[PDB]
Design a protein around this ligand. Structure first.
Ligand SMILES: [Cl-]
Ligand SMILES: [Cl-]
Lengths: 147, 378, 378, 147
């Protein structure tokens, strides 16, 4: 599906500040702190559009923020912030209308690896089985990178 | 299974769209005073004249010349250098006005005329519309937006677009050709026009990943385009029906929309067919759905209802036809009642397509949940 | 998999078809003197006037008023009691005539304007056309034949037909509804009109095995139809494009045919697309074939060529697209050369459909044998 | 396929005057005689449209005549002539445009049996195998009742 309502040629970053080895009390503090930092510099990171997304993996969960980035450079700054300041392994970045998703490994002070995932970030039909990693949005719709 | 598909669109300055807007501007003016009016307006636009004709059954009083000049002036034709002037053009009126008359069931009114209506909806896009026609409308709509707000003051109202999409196994993988013919002033040179149009119109609209090096751009392929609009070519109401509805992606019944009141099934039933087609796809019953409704003049119930899912249906096809008859009242007055079409909202629908814009009564997916429960898909 | 499909057609007395015939009558008159002329004629028909407009680039001299009056007189509008008189109607001309100009390759001429063209052909019928549209044309054509030869002197030119066919697994099994609205004189009573029309028009045309007891007939459902033609409703050129080509069975590009010279791809390419679609089906390559050709203004080669067989192809689809490019020259001047379109034969094509009548240059299956050999189907 | 070129609501009779137990010299005489009789009374039998069709069965052959009958009554007279005068078992009769075919057993002086064959009388695609009974027309196209 082509989400033509979304403004074209912008980048969405799904980013969390959680860890699987920490108290959820601490994780929530980290998440609030990260959201503050992103909002504090909208010129650098872009506009935070939603803070009420849940992630998943395989089943653990975490709060995730969607940041709308106006350009690829902003998206890298968000990715760098997660990987360097919040010890994240990667962030999910997908295009505006095509939702062509990829994992960005911005680890390190300079340079970055971007791995394009095969397929597009799309809603998983209700009743279909979830496999591996998926994301639930603020409306309870389930999203996954589908090949 | 790669195959190229092409769709095109025209701007509001195109002569065939000036007639559509003028016809619907007259319709909206009448509906403000007499919502139950009967309007069938046909507009012919020539180099220096606008001929407005048709038959009206209403008690409303409208100034056709004032409406026509205001409509053309809002488009942006203000002096003869553009090829057409709103303040100094002949506006002939051939409208034949009558007087409305004065106990049976209103929903049992027969269709005022026979015809075929097609509704289409696909889960290809977010707004449940074919992709090529949506982006074709975006380019011309962006051209008018850029021209009016002053980003490119040397643009002029007339513009045409044409985008060729490259499908692969039913999914778009890129854009193969973009054509954007625009009318400009003699001030701007040809080379600078192509750079500005490419950077300011094509780039902000089309996704960057689709525009590869193999994409071919044709921006004013002929040359200078200074004098256009009505002078360049004649314009008539209903000559751009395909670019209005879906482009070439879906079949069309052949009935024009602009200048017709909702009481005529040539317009309301097409909106209704799109309404039921969008709800079926929105309910998850089918990935693509096409609805055909046929009326006989003087008969209330449709003579035939056809649902086509192209083998993408989650329920048996004969069950879908029962659901359409069960939920949606397709009698000619039932369409108005279930869509609330008796409002002056048709001036906006005659510019960049009657479908795909969610602020329209027929673009609401409210019965989608009911249909899904009725089909028992949980 | 039963489903009802409906197609409709209108007689030559319909206001939207009077404009088409008048436009093509002007085109044929010009082509007799200057075959290489450029004609884009638009006709607007009102209650008592005929407005003929457009831009002509020729060296020919034609009397528009004489042509228009003769065309209407041949249709059968001879006095005001019918609602329109050929001898006492206003014929305004807005035609802007220019002068032709005066070394490159003629086949490399770019398209004069952009557009979409669709060609369709199916082995459903003998003439390789959709069945519902063919029989819809038969009824209105029979009505004109009966009226003119004197079998039913009380008939009048305006008439509309609509036939609803009942398919089953892709094959027609009967007719579900027949609608035949005809204009008559006040002499004949309503009850006797239905008996005569049913016996003299519907019976001789439709096969008797399809008309069962479940078939519903709607012959003038409203009532008396005495005053019709241009007085009843306005008529414009190109408002009946769907009934011309295929009805609702096939997609349409949206370009009108009548009043356009062959040099404009809006007409010739549609004929060419039908030509290649008919040959592919006639060669046995596919049961149904749909061709889309798209041109950009100022560019010779088509921007996109699409062949669709709906999964009924005997050869791989990507091989068919190669065959179309190999055999058929789809450049704008190549269409004229391979079809011999520079003749005054377009008066007859604006009455009961441009397709399905074998006496037309684009209805010849001559390259069918060559295509079959190239595909290696023996 | 719907043969819309043919005039609607008329009947076509395929009729032969051959036998499997007679000299082909005699059969040709019978065939010429039958054709003469049909042409001698066009008001009763209709118009003979073709005399250069071959039949088949299962592979024997025979010359067959196609008679266009304007009504069902004419078609019965042709069928009666074959069954009574030329000892034919049946004639093939099919509609005008739909080509809905059936076997008519007009044997006897009065009364008749008509058995509708399931399907329509249609051209058999070139290269497809012929099965059982078929007909070759004057153009060498092969025709069979297909279900
Ligand atoms: Cl990416
Ligand atoms: Cl029979």
């Amino acid at each position: 599906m082509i989400f033509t309502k979304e403004p074209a040629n912008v980048f969405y970053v799904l980013v969390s500040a959680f860890r699987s080895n920490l108290c959820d009390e601490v994780n929530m503090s980290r998440h609030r702190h990260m959201v503050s930092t992103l909002r504090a510099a909208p010129g650098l990171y872009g506009s935070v559009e939603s803070t009420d997304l849940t992630g998943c993996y395989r089943p653990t969960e975490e709060k995730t923020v969607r940041v709308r980035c106006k350009d690829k450079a902003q998206a890298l700054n968000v990715a760098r912030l997660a990987c360097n300041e919040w010890e994240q392994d990667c962030v999910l970045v997908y295009k505006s209308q095509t939702h062509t998703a990829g994992l960005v490994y911005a680890k390190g002070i300079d340079g970055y690896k971007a791995e394009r995932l095969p397929g597009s970030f799309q809603e998983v039909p209700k009743g279909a089985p979830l496999q591996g990693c998926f994301t639930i949005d603020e409306f309870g719709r389930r999203w996954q990178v589908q090949h | 299974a790669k195959h190229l598909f092409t769709s095109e669109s025209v701007s509001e300055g195109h002569p065939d769209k000036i007639a559509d807007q003028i016809s619907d501007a007259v319709l909206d003016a009448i509906l403000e005073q007499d919502p139950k009016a009967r309007v069938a307006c046909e507009t012919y636009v020539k180099t220096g004249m606008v001929l407005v004709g048709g038959e009206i059954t209403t008690s409303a009083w409208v100034d056709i010349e004032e409406i026509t000049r205001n409509t053309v002036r809002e488009i942006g034709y203000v002096h003869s250098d553009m090829g057409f002037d709103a303040n100094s053009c002949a506006v002939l009126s051939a409208i034949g006005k009558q007087s409305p008359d004065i106990r049976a069931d209103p929903l049992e009114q027969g269709a005022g005329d026979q015809g075929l209506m097609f509704g289409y909806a696909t889960n290809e896009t977010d707004v449940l519309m074919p992709a090529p026609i949506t982006y074709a409308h975006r380019l011309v709509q962006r051209q008018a937006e850029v021209r009016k707000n002053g980003t490119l003051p040397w643009l002029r109202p007339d513009a045409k677009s044409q985008v060729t999409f490259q499908y692969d196994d039913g999914k778009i993988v890129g854009i193969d050709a973009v054509v954007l013919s625009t009318q400009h002033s003699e001030e701007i040179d040809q080379k600078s026009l192509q750079e500005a149009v490419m950077e300011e119109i094509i780039k902000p609209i089309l996704p960057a990943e689709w525009l590869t090096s193999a994409t071919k751009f044709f921006i004013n392929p002929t040359g200078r385009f200074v004098i256009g609009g009505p002078m360049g070519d004649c314009g008539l109401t209903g000559r751009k029906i395909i670019v209005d509805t879906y482009g070439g992606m879906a079949r069309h019944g052949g009935g024009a929309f602009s200048g017709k009141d909702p009481s005529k099934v040539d317009r309301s039933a097409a909106y209704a067919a799109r309404y039921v087609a969008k709800n079926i796809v929105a309910a998850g019953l089918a990935d693509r759905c096409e609805i055909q409704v046929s009326y006989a003049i003087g008969v209330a119930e449709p003579t035939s209802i056809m649902v086509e899912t192209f083998g993408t249906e989650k329920v048996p096809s004969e069950q879908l036809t029962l659901l359409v008859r069960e939920f949606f009242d397709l009698r000619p007055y039932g369409l108005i009642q279930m869509l609330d079409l008796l409002h002056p909202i048709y001036k906006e629908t005659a510019a960049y397509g009657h479908f795909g814009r969610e602020h329209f009564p027929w673009e609401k997916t409210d019965k989608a949940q009911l249909l899904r429960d009725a089909a028992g898909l949980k």
